[PDB]
Design a protein around this motif. Structure first.
Motif, PDB file in Angstrom:
ATOM      1  N   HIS A  85      -9.336  -1.458  17.147  1.00 19.11           N
ATOM      2  CA  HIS A  85      -9.454  -0.446  18.190  1.00 19.11           C
ATOM      3  C   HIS A  85      -8.961  -1.031  19.503  1.00 19.11           C
ATOM      4  CE1 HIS A  85     -10.953   2.442  21.023  1.00 19.11           C
ATOM      5  NE2 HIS A  85     -11.977   1.703  21.405  1.00 19.11           N
ATOM      6  N   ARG A  86      -8.158  -0.259  20.235  1.00 19.36           N
ATOM      7  CA  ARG A  86      -7.733  -0.617  21.583  1.00 19.36           C
ATOM      8  C   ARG A  86      -8.850  -0.354  22.542  1.00 19.36           C
ATOM      9  NH1 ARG A  86      -2.569   1.260  21.498  1.00 19.36           N
ATOM     10  NH2 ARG A  86      -0.981  -0.249  20.760  1.00 19.36           N
ATOM     11  N   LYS A  87      -9.778  -1.293  22.645  1.00 19.16           N
ATOM     12  CA  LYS A  87     -10.944  -1.134  23.523  1.00 19.16           C
ATOM     13  C   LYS A  87     -10.594  -1.206  25.007  1.00 19.16           C
ATOM     14  CE  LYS A  87     -14.898  -3.413  22.428  1.00 19.16           C
ATOM     15  NZ  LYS A  87     -13.838  -4.504  22.465  1.00 19.16           N
ATOM     16  N   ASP A  88      -9.841  -2.230  25.400  1.00 16.69           N
ATOM     17  CA  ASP A  88      -9.598  -2.520  26.810  1.00 16.69           C
ATOM     18  C   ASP A  88      -8.389  -3.435  26.940  1.00 16.69           C
ATOM     19  OD1 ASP A  88     -10.635  -5.274  26.238  1.00 16.69           O
ATOM     20  OD2 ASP A  88     -12.628  -4.387  26.398  1.00 16.69           O
TER      21      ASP A  88
ATOM     22  N   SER B 270      -7.236  -5.957  24.303  1.00 16.95           N
ATOM     23  CA  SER B 270      -6.813  -5.475  22.995  1.00 16.95           C
ATOM     24  C   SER B 270      -5.282  -5.383  22.857  1.00 16.95           C
ATOM     25  CB  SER B 270      -7.474  -4.126  22.687  1.00 16.95           C
ATOM     26  OG  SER B 270      -8.863  -4.145  22.989  1.00 16.95           O
ATOM     27  N   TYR B 271      -4.575  -5.666  23.965  1.00 16.02           N
ATOM     28  CA  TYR B 271      -3.102  -5.702  24.032  1.00 16.02           C
ATOM     29  C   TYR B 271      -2.418  -6.370  22.824  1.00 16.02           C
ATOM     30  CZ  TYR B 271      -2.904 -10.675  24.998  1.00 16.02           C
ATOM     31  OH  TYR B 271      -3.000 -12.043  24.880  1.00 16.02           O
TER      32      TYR B 271
ATOM     33  N   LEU C 291      -2.985  -6.039  19.782  1.00 16.09           N
ATOM     34  CA  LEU C 291      -3.004  -5.179  18.593  1.00 16.09           C
ATOM     35  C   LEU C 291      -1.634  -4.565  18.260  1.00 16.09           C
ATOM     36  CD1 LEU C 291      -6.520  -3.480  18.420  1.00 16.09           C
ATOM     37  CD2 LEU C 291      -5.511  -5.104  16.857  1.00 16.09           C
ATOM     38  N   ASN C 292      -0.728  -4.686  19.195  1.00 18.95           N
ATOM     39  CA  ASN C 292       0.592  -4.204  18.967  1.00 18.95           C
ATOM     40  C   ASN C 292       1.648  -5.255  19.173  1.00 18.95           C
ATOM     41  OD1 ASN C 292       1.403  -4.564  21.493  1.00 18.95           O
ATOM     42  ND2 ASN C 292       0.368  -2.726  22.173  1.00 18.95           N
TER      43      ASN C 292
ATOM     44  N   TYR D  55      -0.113  -0.473  11.844  1.00 17.71           N
ATOM     45  CA  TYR D  55      -1.332  -0.503  12.640  1.00 17.71           C
ATOM     46  C   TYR D  55      -2.216   0.741  12.487  1.00 17.71           C
ATOM     47  CZ  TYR D  55      -4.662  -0.515  16.525  1.00 17.71           C
ATOM     48  OH  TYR D  55      -5.805  -0.413  17.293  1.00 17.71           O
TER      49      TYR D  55
ATOM     50  N   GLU E  14      -5.342   2.374  13.937  1.00 20.54           N
ATOM     51  CA  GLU E  14      -6.319   2.545  15.007  1.00 20.54           C
ATOM     52  C   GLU E  14      -7.545   3.309  14.488  1.00 20.54           C
ATOM     53  OE1 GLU E  14      -8.358   2.618  18.302  1.00 20.54           O
ATOM     54  OE2 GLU E  14      -6.310   1.833  18.604  1.00 20.54           O
TER      55      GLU E  14
ATOM     56  N   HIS F 103     -12.957   4.539  19.064  1.00 26.79           N
ATOM     57  CA  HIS F 103     -14.175   3.883  19.506  1.00 26.79           C
ATOM     58  C   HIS F 103     -15.389   4.356  18.708  1.00 26.79           C
ATOM     59  CE1 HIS F 103     -17.319   2.707  22.648  1.00 26.79           C
ATOM     60  NE2 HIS F 103     -16.693   1.587  22.331  1.00 26.79           N
TER      61      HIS F 103
END
Ligand SMILES: NC(=O)c1ccc[n+]([C@@H]2O[C@H](COP(=O)([O-])OP(=O)(O)OC[C@H]3O[C@@H](n4cnc5c(N)ncnc54)[C@H](O)[C@@H]3O)[C@@H](O)[C@H]2O)c1
Lengths: 336, 336, 332, 327, 327, 332
Positions: free
Chosen positions: A108-111, A114-115, A117-118, A125, A127, A130
């Motif tokens: 999950h791209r929390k904040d 989390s950059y 993740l890609n 990927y 996702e 939240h």
């Protein structure tokens, strides 16, 4: 639906949000690869458990049978080189994946953190979105404040067991202390008109392949191995402050003029999360001392002392090094 | 008793403490050389009067006859090179002194800024001691707050006349405004547990011998010419913040990746008094753009704009440049 | 809204030394081709000499005097320095200056005529249209300057606008006019003396760029041309000396710098040859400049020669001889 | 009186004026060493005779008793490296000296080009001169015009005999012609208010270990091997001059833009006596072309080995210019 | 059938096996160009005859009609720069070719040392061979032992005649002696489990444009000009080995510590065929001494000019080693 | 307070491989000369081999077993790595380790004997006294190691303390003992084969140091000696190949790295020759190591070979062959 599923985290601690994703991964792929980030980072209020401990924690929530299709990998941090990290992840993964092209990454791209993740376009990927109400930060805060009801209903039962045994150890008592300290430290800035920014210096003094080090004397990181450095005073230049701190913490027997004239390089370290105090940017100065007898420094007691460490000594005690100081040393080692 | 006496200061404004020393100098030497420091510094709450104005002020306190043995010299600041300053002082002095060895320097070691008073061992040094109750800082504060009784009894009468005429000008109104602003700015940090330190970036972008500049939009220095730069945000790296600010203040039409890849150098500027806000350390990044048409930037209005300036344009408008920005440019010009 | 002209902006670049009837013809053409016209006064802040006798505010006053105030509402004057060895720098300055007027418009045309080698710059603005006007015979600022310093009024009075004629007649009574005649005559005699040489002569000089602690050692010129201008210490190469020897010799002659030759020798960090064909009005002069970096400390004494700060050089740009400011710039 | 004695010269030609010092040498030291300077320098109006030829001349003027206590040593010129020369001199000395410390050098500072007699400090120096006056410049001048009366009374009988025979030489014609051209060239500048000063460019173009060379098409040193080079025109920069001259003399098949881009270095060569036409300073530009086919072009590519073999045929100081960019 | 034809070789000696290809050349192209490789390489058991001598040999085997449509070109060796060689080859070609585009090169890849026939791509290549078998290695072997029966039937009558006369030569004795020494040296290693591998150091010592040289005191290449160099001992580092060897062979008057400090560079020279004793790799150390007096030391200092003149007398690949540190 | 000994501290440095009766004699002398004795166990964390068969905790256990607990109160053990090409580094490590015990005292003496070339280090501690003991005949760890791996008990049992004898008799039954015998025999046969050569042989190998993104390409050794140790890809130079060719050849053989030779060729950034006389136990082996820096991105695939991180190398220091860790260190 995939031959391989990758889930990366810190898991400090593994909570119900993580287990949800780890379960989703087990549905979507045959083999599951768990990557334990922040390997061999010194224990602090943000990473209390070492990576073997985190593996045990996660294993205790799973069954031997499902563990048959689960793989653990640990990966160090390289706060100033994403490429060294990426490579290490690829290499660790390859050893399991054989080389397959059937691979998903769940997260999950929390904040802002989390950059990463890609940075795997090679792979797919997934996702997850939240999951309300499962926050590691909230869990840790609750735990160091001893507020059980704010965390028990947020971790797997095997995790609650672990937290409760661990609540007996010396590490927990030190981490509670350190947590109280930071909380008070941040609170004392609560009425600033702007978030404060901290400026420190650090001295990287090297003689005959050794780096001058100290055991920290002030919180946070009390007792850890660190470079000699500290807060810049209002009316001193960075070099001045760097020299003042080197002398205060090591009482190095080399006159100030030769110290000045031995500075061969400097470099700024600004990773926003390098320090838990605080946004803290440090200015590190590399000082090269010439051949000869090892320079004298204060031999105070042991927790009060300073000493010289080779790279071997440094790697050997990687997890005793404060904040990003190992990285600062490695930067100047690439210069030489 | 000496053929030549040197008194260096800012004299912002010339007060009764200064006149006492200037009188003492006239007793101790035949010719007196007054050195007006901070020549061509942009006007601010610390240096309100330009150096021709300061000369007029001092002349108005003296008689034509005593002026016959008095010599004025103006000298620029070189906040990052004491040696460039020393040389300029020697050269300016030599032109009066013929070359004589009969020379004293009169002054008082007030504080950290008085360190220069002993960088002339060539010549003799006459320390005067402190004269109670004559403080330039107190005088300026009083004057910008309009409190006449706190300054009238502290300056020569010719100085009080000057301050009173000058109290009519546009500069005085701007300086009052700027002074109110700083005072409030510092006051808002009054409950910090530690003096705050500020971190900013600055972008030094150069194309075909021109440097990209802006007219300041926020206080302090409102309306002055400056490099594009600003406060680092909590979660951005220095480079990131540097690029964010360059875009916010200039809307430079060059994609971010080529901007990043065009950074050829950076350097930290940490003179403790560079900024009146505040202890403010700035991180300056030098960006070299390749040959071709001059890059497009926002043409907003005039006070809202950004533009390209050659070194000639820069020297021509030296006294419009904010804080130490001219020095930052000169540092990278020595690199090229 | 229908425009009455092809372009929004017309750019006319020159020295205008002086503005003559050819220039006015192009200026008039520019007023037909563009709503607003930009005159670029080149060679801003160049030391007055026989090629550039009038300063930019004088040249602006001269051109202003040929035009009605209604036309002047459409004309904008801009100045720009010379940087003899850096065209990119100059190109950027012109662009930046034009932009103050243009607001970024793309409807912009440069008018001129590719007269000779010095007109190469006319093809270096591809972002703007170019309008070649062709040659007008014969209007020649060189010829007009010649006639004027020689006192032959019949050769220029019908070459220039009546307002220029008036200005010339007035300037003719100044001390600067006398100074210019003196210098014109000297150069004329100087070239005269070489007229029976089998090939055009080529002169070789050395220049010394001595720097310590942000100061350059300068002199005031003792011989013509450029008598009384600030300059680097240098002079003509003798027949039996090396360039370095010549350089040091000439540095000692002109400044009496109190530093031993052997340490001066050992302090040469770089050297560079400056060869712009028109750098010197005396004939083709190619110069060898030697960068000498003295170890820091007290500046050495000299005997008029002095140490000049980089800020002061920029401040007195217009008192500097030939290309010497560019030579200094090259090194520091 | 001394074990070994050293006398250095060009001896062009050997004149009575040398002979007297040579005689003074035989008296003051038992062994005499004669160092023939300017070895392998292309023949020109300053240096007409090869060094073997000069050996022959100075031999004829001596009777064998004497000729058998005299040794002959040749030394090249390296106009821009004196150290290299001093070294080559003292190393060749040792061949004969064996390592002796009883040595004397004879001569006297006649002008500027006699500066080489302060160094060496390791030996003893005895000053003769001035012997006013025999003058090789004057003698070569006389000899090349035909004014026989001006030099027969000035040089030893054997020298005169060799000079006489030489007049028939294929070289003496071409050397005479050269003398006329230079004297005229200098003469054409007599109305100048100051001594003239010539500026030239040379191109040093190097691919796959070969340097581009040409035979000189114009006087002086006509037909010698040289760098492509010429006089700067009044309105071209040095770079543009170097390039046009390069294209003129070699018609090198490489686009001008690539050539500009391949300039890696430049150096100024300014020895006062490098050119016999008068003070000529040259600006050398070193162009370095990428590997592969040698480009099409008398002009031809020439290896560093080729050059060394034919050092004899190289104009002026062009060999030193090449050497400077190579190490 | 072709305008120009090129045949490159060492021809050591010229054998029937060449001749046949030479014949095949005369047939396929009207003009034939013979490039004599290894020009100016010191004479050794791989390369016994100078290139003029080799010209003489191949001439005798031809009748003038034929000899008058054949041109002879010499090319040096630069063992470490093939580009330099290719260039020198094609430039010398043009002297004759004038600039023609109808050209053929003849030969065939016999081994590893025949790699030079893929480049050149600008010409046409016709493969002959293999002609099994005439073998110069075998022939030089036979010739140096005395086994006459093994080579007379192998080389043209005129070659045999010249070889015959040569047996009397002052060189043939010393070359015979060398052949015996190498054959013995290699033989002494026959019991080795693997082909042996030799490690040597060479010192390249340079002051005031002179390199320190020696005459070889030991076989092979005895009496040739060489760098001071030797075999690494079992317990010394390369640096200490280089230094002792330097002191042994030259007795150079410079303190060991100063020598260590003056090392500015080092390079490894590893061409498989550089030494005839077997695979020898050398480590060259470049020492650069400060200006002044040439230090005391047959060992002697030798200029870059001297070396070029005497390239003929230089051992193995020592010239290329020097050249590498100079440019 | 009157000391019973000359010094406060005595330093005795060795490998002790194994501790024999000569060593015990010096150790006893040190106990007479100093109140506290420091034994420095050199070659810490070196891959077990025929020259260094026992790890430091084993060597400490061995020496401990020869001493009474009352004496052991006066003895301190310290370990220190080898850094074959960096003596300064080693000198500093010894100093730092000693200082933990010494508290900075200046009353310090180093005991030993200048046996052979490998004893040079004995004069590199001028801050401390040196006490030469002379030679004890004949105690030789080489001879004792030889006798032990050859199974000739009569040649070593009377050379070592009884406690060492016991330890040896026990270790003799381990798998490591068998492994060591195997390797001893291989080296013995290897040298045997060269015994009839006219000069001592000199071996030439190449090694490849291939690095991308903080990872070094390593292999496990397929041939003896050091079978199964981690090592750089390298091997013996063939007779007709250049070093670079050999290097690339051998790199391809051992790793099957999926990168074209031409780009491998073009990626060689540096090279260095490693020549410590004892680097390899097989005989004098001098190696040519080539630094290859691959352009960043995904790591290339290989076929046992793998990419190893710098942290992992330090972590597995003791599994590395010969000097290879130092070779890597030299470059990265
Ligand atoms: N250059 C470098 O050294 C580098 C670069 C990037 C990351 N890293 C490392 O990789 C690791 C990054 O892991 P992290 O800190 O993001 O792990 P984490 O433990 O915070 O979270 C693990 C994953 O679970 C997800 N998750 C957590 N709570 C969730 C919720 N309630 N709902 C849905 N999803 C939730 C997170 O988004 C994340 O994808 C760290 O060890 C970091 O230091 C290193």
């Amino acid at each position: 639906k995939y031959q391989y599923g990758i889930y990366i985290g810190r898991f400090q601690p593994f909570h119900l949000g993580h287990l949800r994703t780890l379960n989703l991964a087990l549905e979507k792929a045959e083999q599951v690869i768990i990557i334990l980030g922040s390997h061999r980072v010194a224990a602090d209020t943000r990473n209390p458990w070492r990576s073997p401990e985190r593996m045990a924690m996660i294993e205790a929530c799973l069954s031997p049978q499902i563990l048959k299709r689960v793989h653990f990998l640990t990966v160090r941090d390289w706060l100033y080189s994403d490429n060294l990290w990426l490579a290490a992840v690829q290499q660790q993964v390859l050893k399991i994946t054989g080389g397959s092209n059937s691979v998903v990454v769940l997260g999950h791209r929390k904040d802002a953190s989390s950059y990463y993740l890609n940075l795997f376009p090679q792979w797919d990927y997934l996702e997850t979105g939240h999951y309300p109400d499962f926050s590691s930060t909230a869990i840790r805060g609750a735990y160091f404040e001893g507020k059980e009801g704010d965390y028990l209903d947020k971790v797997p039962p095997a995790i609650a067991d672990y937290l409760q045994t661990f609540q007996k150890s010396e590490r927990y008592i030190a981490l509670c202390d350190e947590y109280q300290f930071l909380q008070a430290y941040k609170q004392a800035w609560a009425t600033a008109p702007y978030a404060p920014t901290f400026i420190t210096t650090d001295a990287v003094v090297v003689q005959a392949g050794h780096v001058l080090m100290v055991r920290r004397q002030a919180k946070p990181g009390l007792g850890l191995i660190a470079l000699p450095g500290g807060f810049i005073k209002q009316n001193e230049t960075l070099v001045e402050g760097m020299l003042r701190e080197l002398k205060e913490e090591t009482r190095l027997k080399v006159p100030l003029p030769v110290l000045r004239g031995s500075i061969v390089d400097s470099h700024v370290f600004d990773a926003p999360g390098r320090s838990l105090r605080g946004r803290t940017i440090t200015h590190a100065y590399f000082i090269q001392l010439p051949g000869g007898e090892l320079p004298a420094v204060k031999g105070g007691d042991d927790a009060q002392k300073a000493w010289w460490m080779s790279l071997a000594d440094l790697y050997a005690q990687e997890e005793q090094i404060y904040e990003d100081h190992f990285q600062i040393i490695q930067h100047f080692v690439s210069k030489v």
